[PDB]
Amino acid sequence: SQLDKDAFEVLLANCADEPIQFPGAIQPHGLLFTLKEPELTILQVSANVQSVLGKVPDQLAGQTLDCVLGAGWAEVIRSTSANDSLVDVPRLLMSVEGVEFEALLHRSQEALVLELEIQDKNMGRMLRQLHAAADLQTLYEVSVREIQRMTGYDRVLIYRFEEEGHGQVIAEASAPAMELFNGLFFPASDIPEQARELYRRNWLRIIPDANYTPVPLVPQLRPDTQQQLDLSFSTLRSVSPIHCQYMKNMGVLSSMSVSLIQGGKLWGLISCGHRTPLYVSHELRSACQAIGQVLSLQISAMEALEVSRQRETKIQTLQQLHQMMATSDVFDGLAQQPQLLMDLVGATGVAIIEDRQTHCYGNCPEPSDIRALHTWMMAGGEPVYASHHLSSVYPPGEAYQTLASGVLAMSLPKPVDNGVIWFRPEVKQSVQWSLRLQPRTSFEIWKVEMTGIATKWSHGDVFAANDLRRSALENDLARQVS
Amino acid sequence: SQLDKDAFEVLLANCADEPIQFPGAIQPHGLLFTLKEPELTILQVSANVQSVLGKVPDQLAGQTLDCVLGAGWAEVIRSTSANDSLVDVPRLLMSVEGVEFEALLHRSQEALVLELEIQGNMGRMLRQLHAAADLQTLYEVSVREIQRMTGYDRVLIYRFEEEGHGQVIAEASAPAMELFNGLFFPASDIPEQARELYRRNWLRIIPDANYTPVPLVPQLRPDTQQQLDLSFSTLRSVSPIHCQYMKNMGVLSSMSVSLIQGGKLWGLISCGHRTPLYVSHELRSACQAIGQVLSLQISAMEALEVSRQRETKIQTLQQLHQMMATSDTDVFDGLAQQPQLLMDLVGATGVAIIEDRQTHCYGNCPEPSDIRALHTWMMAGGEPVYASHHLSSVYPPGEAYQTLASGVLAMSLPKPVDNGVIWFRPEVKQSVQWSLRLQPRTSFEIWKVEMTGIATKWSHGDVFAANDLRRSALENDLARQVSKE
Numbered sequence A: 001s002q003l004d005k006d007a008f009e010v011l012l013a014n015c016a017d018e019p020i021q022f023p024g025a026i027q028p029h030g031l032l033f034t035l036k037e038p039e040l041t042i043l044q045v046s047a048n049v050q051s052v053l054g055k056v057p058d059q060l061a062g063q064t065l066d067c068v069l070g071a072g073w074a075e076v077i078r079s080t081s082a083n084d085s086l087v088d089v090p091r092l093l094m095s096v097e098g099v100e101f102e103a104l105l106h107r108s109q110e111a112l113v114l115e116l117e118i119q120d121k122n123m124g125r126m127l128r129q130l131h132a133a134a135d136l137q138t139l140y141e142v143s144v145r146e147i148q149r150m151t152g153y154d155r156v157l158i159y160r161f162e163e164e165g166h167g168q169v170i171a172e173a174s175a176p177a178m179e180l181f182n183g184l185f186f187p188a189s190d191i192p193e194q195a196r197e198l199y200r201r202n203w204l205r206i207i208p209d210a211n212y213t214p215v216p217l218v219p220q221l222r223p224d225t226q227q228q229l230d231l232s233f234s235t236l237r238s239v240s241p242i243h244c245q246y247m248k249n250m251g252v253l254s255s256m257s258v259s260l261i262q263g264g265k266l267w268g269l270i271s272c273g274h275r276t277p278l279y280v281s282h283e284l285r286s287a288c289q290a291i292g293q294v295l296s297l298q299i300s301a302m303e304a305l306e307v308s309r310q311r312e313t314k315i316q317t318l319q320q321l322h323q324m325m326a327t328s329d330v331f332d333g334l335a336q337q338p339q340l341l342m343d344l345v346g347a348t349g350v351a352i353i354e355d356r357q358t359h360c361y362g363n364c365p366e367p368s369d370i371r372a373l374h375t376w377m378m379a380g381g382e383p384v385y386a387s388h389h390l391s392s393v394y395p396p397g398e399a400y401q402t403l404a405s406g407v408l409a410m411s412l413p414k415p416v417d418n419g420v421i422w423f424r425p426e427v428k429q430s431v432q433w434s435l436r437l438q439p440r441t442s443f444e445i446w447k448v449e450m451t452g453i454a455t456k457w458s459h460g461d462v463f464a465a466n467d468l469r470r471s472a473l474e475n476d477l478a479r480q481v482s
Numbered sequence B: 001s002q003l004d005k006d007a008f009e010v011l012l013a014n015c016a017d018e019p020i021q022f023p024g025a026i027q028p029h030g031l032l033f034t035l036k037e038p039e040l041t042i043l044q045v046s047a048n049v050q051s052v053l054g055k056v057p058d059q060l061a062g063q064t065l066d067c068v069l070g071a072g073w074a075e076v077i078r079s080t081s082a083n084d085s086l087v088d089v090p091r092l093l094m095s096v097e098g099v100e101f102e103a104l105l106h107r108s109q110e111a112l113v114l115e116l117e118i119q120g121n122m123g124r125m126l127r128q129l130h131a132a133a134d135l136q137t138l139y140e141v142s143v144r145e146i147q148r149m150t151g152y153d154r155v156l157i158y159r160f161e162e163e164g165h166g167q168v169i170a171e172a173s174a175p176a177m178e179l180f181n182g183l184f185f186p187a188s189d190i191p192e193q194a195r196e197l198y199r200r201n202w203l204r205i206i207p208d209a210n211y212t213p214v215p216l217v218p219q220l221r222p223d224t225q226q227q228l229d230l231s232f233s234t235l236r237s238v239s240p241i242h243c244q245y246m247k248n249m250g251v252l253s254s255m256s257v258s259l260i261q262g263g264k265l266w267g268l269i270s271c272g273h274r275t276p277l278y279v280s281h282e283l284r285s286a287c288q289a290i291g292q293v294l295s296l297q298i299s300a301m302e303a304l305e306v307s308r309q310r311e312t313k314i315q316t317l318q319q320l321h322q323m324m325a326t327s328d329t330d331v332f333d334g335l336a337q338q339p340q341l342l343m344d345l346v347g348a349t350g351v352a353i354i355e356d357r358q359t360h361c362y363g364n365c366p367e368p369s370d371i372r373a374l375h376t377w378m379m380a381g382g383e384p385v386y387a388s389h390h391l392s393s394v395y396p397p398g399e400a401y402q403t404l405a406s407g408v409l410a411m412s413l414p415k416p417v418d419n420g421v422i423w424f425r426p427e428v429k430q431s432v433q434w435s436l437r438l439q440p441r442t443s444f445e446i447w448k449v450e451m452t453g454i455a456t457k458w459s460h461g462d463v464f465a466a467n468d469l470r471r472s473a474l475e476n477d478l479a480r481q482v483s484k485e
């Protein structure tokens, strides 16, 4: 299939900005209808419907639901929709030719979009177990454990989305015969922003098969709209061939994703993976969604504990810090307890510039390196830095990324010989793991993507730094007087 | 007749300090065994064993479980208890002489206390709770679906104010039955030991009201004093005071899900049922999970609530700045040109702007000559803020406006001719409107005297908002101080 292969290549030419909200195709495990709500007249119908219902989608276009779905059920659908907002609709189940379809209704472009998903013919204790978790890591462990336990899926993962966008596999429950994924990082380019919008606006994305031929959805433009059909809010969609082949080369044939949402933001993704195709029942579909609606609230509540404790120990930090500031230069005294400065931000590497021998601690490059690094701090004038990239401001400084890649540095406003640099290395060294569209390849792409880019600094973490400079800006006048 | 009444009257005198952490008795719907940790020798046994099992309870002390629980089941619970810390324990169902007991194990004072209790929609429920947009709507759906699953007639949710009093914020009453929405009862209605036991655990269950507690024998702890710690035990005697309280209501079965915002008792979901009924283990955990989930939502959504107020408060202060700047005669009198905006800045009902003998009042406040003394009494201390939960408690002659002006907060710059931006609040007696010995009416009536002259509490943000205006008033006057040119 040479003619198919090169035609697939042109798809890979552009993927960051590709129309995926309006593919014009749906997965073959259901039916799709686009109607005018008051009369329930068909505007769009997929080509899958030929294999289950009347002849051709074009003839059904422009007609009423009373023909395709028969009588009685049409009036039932009209009664259920009525004038309701279509929020928290009860469970519906239809049977047009002995096949049971779950009917999910929503409204797009003032049109009734109805998805007939084909369906083939404990919880409190687990919530208590989630509540019993004392830290975030144990929470992740128990959540993935029970999800893999009851979902029945061979592989269950969870990614957390950093502010930079490169997802991190923070936990897993992999069964034997799949590779481990703890600490794996994949670039944000692996998920287009349109797919991110689709994930955030929904709560559950299911792809039961990654080896399928998308079915046409004709007419591609609505007769009364002359524009593409919004399929964002439909479970029955078309999977892009690029991520389809990604799944094929990832070993995953059936996948799920529970979009963990915190305050309108996509905190992460409870993902799955299964070589044998599996069709998920709605009862378990809601339970997994109920996990995300609870766990994301539980996670945000638990980091709300963590962000309080970390901020709390930051508050105490300057309390014991300032006692040694008052004991005896101001930036000279902080070097006698280097581990106390580490916990203020989580630097994993610190150094204090003083006189000539810049007394570094933890891990740190040679003095010939840090000396030619802090010069790009005080010329700008900013007392603090949020430097994921080491060499964004200092181009030829790529020789420090072995140890020094994230520079949130402070100093006294003294123009000469001051500073206490908190080096966070590249995330590449922190996590050790292990053709085209491979998890191995995206790891390699991430290595170039992460090259020189370090771990993100929290706003409070920079604030907690600013207090240390402010605390050092308190007793200096007392030090000057004394 | 009089003999029973004689005992109760002595009990009613010392309810505020009564030992309910060590009742010495258990409810008749199960058994309790306190054992030595390594050998499982019966250290304490309830008197109900002569009925549940038939063996005398006076004896059997200091002997292994083999007499009652056999050897195989004793070994099973030995394996379950040992090296587990009892953090997460699966369901243990035992069958002694054809009777099924659900086993709950814990440890108090280094002894194994074992309690033998005689024996799809969750996803939609969680989705419905998460879909709530407002706190009142959240309460309504919570109580309505709790009444939908649990067969208990009345379902209420009390939100405990920081003062200590409980109010029924939402209620799902059965048709043709008493209505308690908007009710208030005092803090003394629930003792501090009871509140500690509520916050320590998650559920309190009283299957039957008119019940005779069955005591423990031997009563005194064989090891040390302080008796048996029945604080983490689901099976525990109910004090006759609250017992007759429930009996008067007509409700004989009572559920109670302790809503905990971390380590604080935010409130209680109470299911009152007029007919005795059971709970079942599956429903017991589902109700507990609802309280754990709902308290997560309240804690999360309350943060949404205050942030909305914080955004509204911050925006108003900059909004008031534009109004304040346009004034040409008096900064605070100019602030009175938009009084309805001033009311909602801090949260209040009456607002008074005080000029020289001209109290530019707006809303519900006394006539100027009465709160004049309150304005001068502020000058007695010169406090930047005067957040007062109770007015008559601090200001003696507060009865002249105790009905309407009880919760007072104000602020003013130090000036020769002082002003006021007093933010009154009516006593919550006026806000509440609801229809002999232990009744909600007398509880409401005893609450009315208890909460006489006390309005709702001022939050930290409310007190903070007054300072921001005072900073703005200082800053606006600071610009006014230079604009004499």
Ligand SMILES: *C/C=C1/C(=C/c2[nH]c(/C=C3[NH+]=C(/C=C4/NC(=O)C(C=C)=C4C)C(C)=C\3CCC(=O)O)c(CCC(=O)O)c2C)NC(=O)[C@H]1C
Pocket: A014, A015, A016, A020, A181, A184, A185, A186, A189, A190, A191, A192, A195, A205, A238, A239, A240, A242, A243, A246, A247, A250, A255, A256, A257, A269, A271, A272, A437, A439, A442
């Ligand atoms: C610019 C185009 C690209 C792309 C397209 C694409 N990706 C997704 C969604 C992905 N891709 C994931 C990639 C992974 N990274 C890993 O480390 C692993 C496995 C260990 C995988 C699979 C990924 C996790 C997602 C989210 C799915 C989930 O369930 O978590 C989409 C959206 C597909 C859809 O139809 O929803 C598209 C179109 N693939 C590329 O390789 C880049 C170039």
Ligand SMILES: *C/C=C1/C(=C/c2[nH]c(/C=C3[NH+]=C(/C=C4/NC(=O)C(C=C)=C4C)C(C)=C\3CCC(=O)O)c(CCC(=O)O)c2C)NC(=O)[C@H]1C
Pocket: B014, B015, B016, B020, B180, B183, B184, B185, B188, B189, B190, B191, B194, B198, B204, B237, B238, B239, B241, B242, B245, B246, B249, B255, B256, B257, B268, B269, B270, B438, B440, B443
């Ligand atoms: C000083 C002692 C007293 C006391 C003791 C007591 N009360 C409780 C628990 C109660 N009592 C409640 C009473 C109500 N007040 C109302 O307004 C209504 C109804 C509208 C009721 C029922 C009440 C709500 C609780 C908390 C129950 C819950 O929902 O969690 C106890 C604890 C008993 C136990 O075993 O749990 C005690 C000891 N009652 C008094 O009236 C005063 C004198």
